[PDB]
Amino acid sequence: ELTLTVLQELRKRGKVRVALYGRDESTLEPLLNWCLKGIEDVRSASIVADWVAVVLELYGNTLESSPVLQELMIDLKTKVRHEIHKSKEAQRIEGMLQLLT
Amino acid sequence: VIEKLSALDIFFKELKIKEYISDPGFLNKDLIFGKFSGNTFLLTHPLFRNLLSLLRLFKQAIVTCPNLPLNELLEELFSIRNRELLLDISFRILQDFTRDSIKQEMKKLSKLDVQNFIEFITSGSTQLFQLLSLVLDSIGLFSLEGALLENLTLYIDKQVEIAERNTELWNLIDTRALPTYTMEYLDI
Amino acid sequence: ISLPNFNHFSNSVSLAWSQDGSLIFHGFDDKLQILDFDTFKKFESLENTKTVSEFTLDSEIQTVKLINDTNLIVATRTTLNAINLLRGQVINSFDLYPF
Amino acid sequence: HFFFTDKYKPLLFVDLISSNELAIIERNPLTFHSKQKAFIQPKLVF
Amino acid sequence: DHLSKIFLTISKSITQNPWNEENLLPLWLKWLLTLKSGELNSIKDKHTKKNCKHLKSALRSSEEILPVLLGIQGRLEMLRRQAKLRED
Amino acid sequence: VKWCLIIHGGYLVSIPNLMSTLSSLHSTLKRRSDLLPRLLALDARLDCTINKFKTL
C-alpha cells in the first residue's frame, strides 16, 4: 500500500515520463518485479497499467536489445491473460447476479 | 392562438391554410385542449392521450413522443418488421423506463414472442444485448428450450470472440554507435 | 436509492423537496417527475385525480423551485411556468427565449 | 575536383589496405573501456 | 505507398462490415499496425484520419457491446448447469 | 459463487433483499468488471510491442 501511495502521488504531482527518463534495465526490473507482484490486485491495476504503458512506449527498442526484459514481458502477458480470464468470468458472474435479482 | 386553433405565425398560417425551440416557446406559454383539437404540426407538438399516441408519425412518435406506455411499446417492438425499429425502440425503452419495469412487462409478455425474438436475433446494438439480458432475467430460469439455449450460446460465443478481437484492434489503432568492424562504401 | 439506468445522458437535471419531506420534484430534460419519499416511487394517488407524477415540457428543465406546499415555479431552457400543487392547474407563464 | 567526408570524426589511421580497400581506424574512447564515473549534474528535463 | 492504399481499402471494408466473422482482414490490420504504425500516422492528415476516427467510433461501439455480451454468456453457462442438474 | 447461484438460485428469487444480502459480492464483481477494459487496452499495447520486437 505504501508503494501504491507513492506511485499515486508521483503520477499525480509529476509526470511518469520524468519519473522514468534516465532508466536502464537494472532499474527497470524492480519496477516490473513490483508489477508482477501487484497487477493481480484490484486496487492498483489501472495505475500499474498507466506506468507499464508509458514505460513500453518510451523503451520500445531497448526492450529488444535487452533479453531478460523480454522474458518479463512474456510472463507479464501470461499473467495478464490470467487476469483477462478472471475479469471476464467476473463479468459473467455479474450477469448471472443480474439474472438472479 | 387558441382561437386560431379552434377556428382551424408560420405554424398558425399553415394550420389556417390546411383548414423547434422558438415554436415551443411561442406556442407553449389550453395546451391539452389544443392537442385534443389537433388530434407536421403534430410532429412539432410531439417534439415540443398515450393510448392515442400508441394507436397512431410512427417514426416521429418512437423518437419524440412525450407519453408512451410500456405495453404498446413492447408490442410495437415485438412487431418483427425490423426497419431499424429494433435499435430505435430498444434505445427508446432503455431511455424511458426502468429495468425492473421492463422485467415485469416481459414477465407479462407471452413466451411465444420471446422465443420468436430469440430466434430472430440468433438468425439475423448494446441496447439489443441489454434487452436480451433483460428478457433472460424476466423469463428467469425454468421455461426455456435447451436447443434454443445452444443456438444462443454459439451466437453469443462467436459474437464475444469478434468483440474481444475488435477491442484489441481498437486499442491497437489507439496506440549504440557503430560496431567494432563494419564494411562501408564511399563516393568519388 | 432509486436506480434507473437511462441509455441517454443529459445533465440538465434538478430536484426540489416538499417542505414536510413528502415528495420530490425532479426536473429532467422534457420531463417533470414526482417521487414518493417512503419508497422512491412515483406519486401514486389512489383517487386518481390526474395529479400525476409525469409532466411533459417543451425543453430541457433548468430549475424547479417550490415557494410553499402550494406553488411551484419551473424554469425550463425556453420559458417559465408557475403551477399549483393542490390542483394541477397552470397559473402563469413567461418567455425566456428572446433573452 | 575533390571531396572530404565528415562521417569519421574519431580516427587513428587511414590507409589503403589493397587496390581499393581502405582502412579507417577510429576510436571509441569513453563509451567502451574507461567508463569513468562523472559528477551528477542533471539537466532540468520536464 | 501500396501498403497505405491497402490500409485505406482495409479500413473502409472493415467500417462497412463491422461484424464480419472473418479474421484475415483484422489480422492484416493487426500486422500492418504492429509493424508500420508511425509511418501510417505520418502518411496523411485529413482523409485517412477521418477514416480512422470513423472506424474508431465503430470499434468503440463494439467495445460498448462487449460487457453485456459477457453477462449473457455467464447467464447461459448458469442455465446450462441448471439444465445439467435438471437431468441429474 | 457460480455453484452457489446455480444450485440455490430460486431461494435468491424468493429473498426480498438481494442488494442488502450480497452488497459485498456485487461490489467486488463490479470492481473487476471496471478493471476489465483498461486492462484489455494494456493487452493490446502489450502484444503490439511484443510482436514488434519479435519480428524485429
Q: For residues B92 and C5, is the Cβ–Cβ distance under 8 A?
A: no
Phi, then psi, of E29 in degrees rounded to 5: -60, -35
User: Resolution in angstroms, to 1 decimal, for this deposition?
Assistant: 3.8
Phi, then psi, of B91 in degrees rounded to 5: -60, -40
Strand partners, C55: C32
How far is the CA of C50 from the CAs of A55, C86, C87, in angstroms?
Answer: 64, 11, 9
CA geometry: angle B91, B157, B110, nearest 5 deg: 50
DSSP-derived secondary structure letter, D4: -
**Grid cell for residue C86:** 393542490
Q: Which residues 6+ apart lie within 8 Å of B100 measured at CB?
A: none
Q: For residues C80 and B5, is the Cβ–Cβ distance under 8 A?
A: no
**Grid cell for residue C67:** 415557494
Whether E67 contacts chain F with CB within 8 A: yes
**B170 contacts on F by Cβ (under 8 Å):** 44
Given an 8 Å threshold on Cβ–Cβ distance, is C97 in contact with B21? yes
Q: For residues A81 and A39, is the Cβ–Cβ distance under 8 A?
A: no
For C72-83, give one letter per residue: b (16+ CB within 10 A) or e. bbbbbbbbbbeb
**Grid cell for residue E14:** 472493415
**Grid cell for residue C1:** 436509492
Chain B contacts to D (CB-CB under 8 A): 176-178, 186-188
Given an 8 Å threshold on Cβ–Cβ distance, is B141 in contact with A99? yes
DSSP-derived secondary structure letter, C21: S
Given an 8 Å threshold on Cβ–Cβ distance, is A49 in contact with F38? yes
Given an 8 Å threshold on Cβ–Cβ distance, is F35 in contact with A46? yes
- CA distance linking residue E79 with residue B146, whole number of Å: 9
Angle between helices A45-58 and A2-13 (to 10 degrees): 60
Whether A79 contacts chain F with CB within 8 A: no
- CA distance linking residue B21 with residue B48, whole number of Å: 8
- CA distance linking residue B105 with residue B101, whole number of Å: 6
Q: Compute the radius of gyration of chain A from its Cα atoms.
A: 16
Whether F13 contacts chain E with CB within 8 A: no
Given an 8 Å threshold on Cβ–Cβ distance, is A96 in contact with E73? no
- CA distance linking residue D12 with residue B172, whole number of Å: 49
- How many residues are listed for chain B in this entry? 188
- CA distance linking residue B117 with residue B78, whole number of Å: 7
- Residue recorded with cell 417512503: C38
- Residue recorded with cell 500500500: A1
* Residue type, position B136, single letter: L
For B156-182, give one letter per residue: b (16+ CB within 10 A) or e. beebbebbbebbbbbbbbebeeeeeee
**E77 contacts on F by Cβ (under 8 Å):** 2
Q: Which residues 6+ apart lie within 8 Å of E11 measured at CB?
A: E29, E48, E51, E52, E55
**E window 20-49, beta carbon within 8 A of F:** 31, 33-35
Q: How many CB atoms lie within 10 A of CB D6?
A: 5
**F9 contacts on E by Cβ (under 8 Å):** 78, 82
CA distance A86 to chain D (A): 39
C23-28 and D22-25 beta bridge pairing: unpaired
Q: Which residues 6+ apart lie within 8 Å of E19 measured at CB?
A: B159, B162
Q: Which string of DSSP letters, residue by residue, matches E20-53?
A: ----HHHHHHHHHHHHHHHHHHTT-SSHHHHHHH
Nearest to E75 among A88, A89, A96 (CB): A96
How far is the CA of F27 from the CAs of A83, A94, D24, F33, in angstroms?
Answer: 18, 10, 70, 10
DSSP-derived secondary structure letter, B110: -
- CA distance linking residue E76 with residue F1, whole number of Å: 16
**Grid cell for residue A97:** 447476479
- CA distance linking residue B38 with residue B30, whole number of Å: 12
- CA distance linking residue D23 with residue D14, whole number of Å: 5
- CA distance linking residue B45 with residue A75, whole number of Å: 62
